[PDB]
């Protein structure tokens, strides 16, 4: 920690060319931190899309003009061609930010539904998202055991279409690193 892991992940993604990735992170505030790093280093909202699907009421006080912080939800971005095959032209704000994002800095639960769902059509949007985009999962050790199982299911599904999985965990256990490699290998 403290060495700039997420910046190194973006560097590794950009080494192969232009970036198309889903930064799936635990917690809302860690996604906010990675979004703020992406904003102040080089990434605008035409490429980045911070997705936290709860609409929290945590606002910044003191000075709105002198903030230079509090990464928000606008996504000027670019609507992908996949929105025409989704129901009713995808959706409003949230699913447009999901599907059409080049870089999707999101909470992870908007990506683990790609592996499948009980009832409804909630699988298709993260499925089609992870089909054409890379997957970057940071500090996977903080998740639960079943959470890590479904995250490696997501890694297997992402590798099923040739995309690249970046795992960023310092305290990795050989077991975890191995089963994530075996999911990527399958």
């Amino acid at each position: 920690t403290g060495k700039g892991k997420t910046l190194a992940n973006l560097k590794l993604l950009q080494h192969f060319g232009n970036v198309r990735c889903s930064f799936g992170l635990g917690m809302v505030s860690l996604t906010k931190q990675t979004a703020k790093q992406f904003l102040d280093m080089g990434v605008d909202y035409n490429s980045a899309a911070m997705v936290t699907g709860f609409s929290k009421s945590r606002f910044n006080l003191g000075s709105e003009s002198l903030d230079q912080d509090e990464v928000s939800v606008e996504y000027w971005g670019q609507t992908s061609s996949l929105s025409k095959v989704f129901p009713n032209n995808n959706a409003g704000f949230k699913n447009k930010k999901l599907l059409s994002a080049p870089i999707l800095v999101t909470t992870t639960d908007h990506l683990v539904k790609a592996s499948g769902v009980k009832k409804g059509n909630k699988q298709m949007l993260p499925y089609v998202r992870c089909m054409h985009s890379d997957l970057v999962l940071d500090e996977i050790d903080d998740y639960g055991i079943e959470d890590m199982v479904v995250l490696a299911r997501l890694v297997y599904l992402t590798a099923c279409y040739g995309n690249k999985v970046i795992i960023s965990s310092a305290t990795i256990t050989p077991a975890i690193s191995n089963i994530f490699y075996e999911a990527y290998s399958s």
Binding site: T1, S57, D109, K118, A152, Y156, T171, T173, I176, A183
Partner: protein, 278 residues
Amino acid sequence: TTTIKDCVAVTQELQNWETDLSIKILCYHSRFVGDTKAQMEEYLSKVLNRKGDEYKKFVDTTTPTAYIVVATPVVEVGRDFDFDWAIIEPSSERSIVQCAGRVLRHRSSTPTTHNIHILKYPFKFYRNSNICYDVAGYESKGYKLKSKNMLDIYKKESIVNSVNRLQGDAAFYTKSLTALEHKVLLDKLTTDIADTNVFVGGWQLTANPHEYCKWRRGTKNEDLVLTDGKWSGNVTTTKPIQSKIWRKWQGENGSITVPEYLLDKTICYNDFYGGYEN
């Protein structure tokens, strides 16, 4: 510490603790109202930032003071905090490594004697001596430690880093915490398909990997909501001990997440420490 009532027990003991030290106590668990919780976060991030000396102005560093933050595993995940020292209630070894990462995270000065004091037992030993590390840990009913003494299951003096988690040991998992951790990790995330496993094949066709392997599997979790100072369910606001509280932010809106088990009794929300059993 491990859980919320454990945190308020440590807080209520330390507040009533007579000493010459100027203890200033904070509670940092997850059961808090929208406003109060967010306020704790921003304050803690701006006082524990030790890459510069900007914090000297967010706390009273003029007077010798012990600024103590009693927290649950919400501090060891995703927090850019830098403490001078930590006292850890043992639940898992990755908790030890992560709370080591909350001490001297921003500085580079080496400690001289000892900067982490690990407790002898988790507090669930006095409540359940059969199993005590299952809360926020990989101990469970199928993987039981033979002894719960941390002299038996951990090194008495140890340089805590990622090395013990990085190495990986499957032998002697019943009397060491690290090998207990590694055992569970290879016995649940295995190269099989099972039904709740990771290579799942044949079952993707079925609804089984989405029912028996539930993402964010938590307890029932109902949400008692504070509306403008007036609580919804069986909450009953209370008064904290006002002995050593350094900072206490008030809250009026927001919601608290209470497990259905603790819904039976009053969660007794308080401005200083959120939920407990009283």
